[PDB]
Write a protein that binds this ligand. Structure first.
Ligand SMILES: Nc1nc2c(ncn2[C@@H]2O[C@H](COP(=O)(O)OP(=O)(O)O)[C@@H](O)[C@H]2O)c(=O)[nH]1
Ligand SMILES: Nc1nc2c(ncn2[C@@H]2O[C@H](COP(=O)(O)OP(=O)(O)O)[C@@H](O)[C@H]2O)c(=O)[nH]1
Lengths: 244, 244
């Protein structure tokens, strides 16, 4: 199963007999826009096309996925590269800025009944096969106003995991939209910045948030909920969008 | 209390009456070597001198803390900068490489009785005042062969937290050394790379590790233990150094 490796190790009790357990892969991945290596991110070695797409929108390197005319995932020395053919307009924009594109306040369009949230919380797992085996993954899911988790993606690192989902949803155009993002991690200012960039109005994080995170969500008109556990949830910003 | 902010929010049950809770600060900090901004890292707004030092050794920007002739922490727009005066030799080395210094296999010098570990596990908390209040911190502690936690530092992000401890220990010269590092997080390849750089032979991580992490620890002769919880611990590499 992709992302997982069977490794030899020792339990604290038996330093003389090695055992096997599954460990999660963490390959370095490089996003290469028109030959220029923009970033190397450690990632689970799957859903890289989605990651590449997601990351492009997230960081505001593109406005549309139509801004990309090619994507090939290639092996390298360290690990993997996603070779991305990019609009001259957007490439120059990236060269120039040398992310930081502007965020821009969100509209109020989305609603969410917090009663539908618990069920979604119990199903985040369904998108972490390696997390399940391994304990080393985070996931990011898209949840419709219904509460239904339409799809989701895991990763060794929470941001890459979010980027992948953002990429996913970027490709499910229309039928998705609406809804919210569910994330297994803590919510960091960059996570909310990315979400907002991609038109996400509500973000549910399973753990804590930072001062800066909530401050950013205020100026973005993004609705930030943290400590989302079955029976709990704490909203830091723009509660206007949620019901009981 | 530094690092903490009292913020207004809403519990899932009461979207009409705001309450207060403590949230953790996440200021952007820039490490500025001789006027050149090398990195911006999000961090808890304390122990920045230690962070700056730690990070320098970690990344191999310096060999000794004697390589630094000045450190001033200054406020800015985003947040904070640590202005670092650096050896011409080491500065040029950093300019040139434009981390990646060589790691170099560790010697076998350290031992640890896993029986002394549980107690240390119960005391990691003692180094997260904001973690305690907030749930948003990670910590990195130095544990002597004794099992005694001599000191420790928390942060919003695990790496910065480790860097801070590495900085700390870099300043406790001699009396520390020996021992091991205890970390509240998952162990990532960069965490082990940093530790090794600073002469740490044993690393205890409270959570999972990645394929790459353990692979790196093999070539570094670093002893990597993960899933360290009271009564548990799982060693991925060089068990030679530990007893039962
Ligand atoms: N393969 C494997 N998985 C583990 C082991 N120990 C724990 N896990 C899984 O990984 C997760 C550990 O995450 P942890 O650091 O304990 O955070 P926590 O789950 O919130 O306590 C757990 O949810 C377990 O399902 C282990 O020894 N091997
Ligand atoms: N200030 C504050 N702290 C919390 C709240 N909920 C949980 N915490 C603390 O933050 C931690 C939450 O981390 P969590 O994401 O649940 O990981 P876990 O502790 O392994 O389950 C807990 O250890 C709590 O001590 C809250 O609503 N407010």
């Amino acid at each position: 199963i992709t992302g997982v490796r069977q490794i030899e190790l020792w339990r604290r009790d038996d330093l003389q007999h090695p055992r096997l357990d599954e460990v999660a892969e963490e390959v370095p991945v490089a996003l290469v826009y028109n030959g220029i290596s923009h970033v190397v991110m450690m990632a689970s070695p799957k859903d890289l096309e989605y990651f590449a797409l997601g990351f492009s929108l997230s960081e505001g390197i593109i406005e549309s996925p139509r801004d990309i005319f090619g994507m090939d995932v290639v092996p390298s020395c360290n690990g993997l590269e996603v070779q991305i053919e990019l609009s001259s307009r957007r490439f120059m924009g990236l060269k120039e800025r040398r992310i930081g594109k502007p965020v821009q306040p969100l509209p109020f369009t989305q609603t969410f009944d917090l009663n539908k949230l618990d069920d979604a919380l119990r199903h985040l797992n369904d998108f972490q096969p390696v997390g399940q085996l391994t304990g080393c993954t985070h996931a990011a899911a898209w949840m419709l106003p219904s509460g239904e988790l339409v799809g989701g993606h895991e990763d060794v690192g929470r941001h890459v995991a979010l980027d992948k989902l953002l990429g996913r949803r970027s490709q499910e155009g229309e039928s998705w939209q609406q809804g919210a993002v569910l994330v297994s991690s803590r919510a960091s200012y960059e996570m909310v910045q990315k979400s907002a960039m991609c038109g996400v109005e509500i973000l549910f994080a399973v753990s804590a948030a930072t001062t800066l995170a909530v401050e950013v969500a205020e100026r973005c008109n993004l609705t930030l909920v943290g400590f989302c556990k079955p029976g709990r949830a704490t909203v830091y910003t723009h509660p206007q969008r949620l019901s009981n």
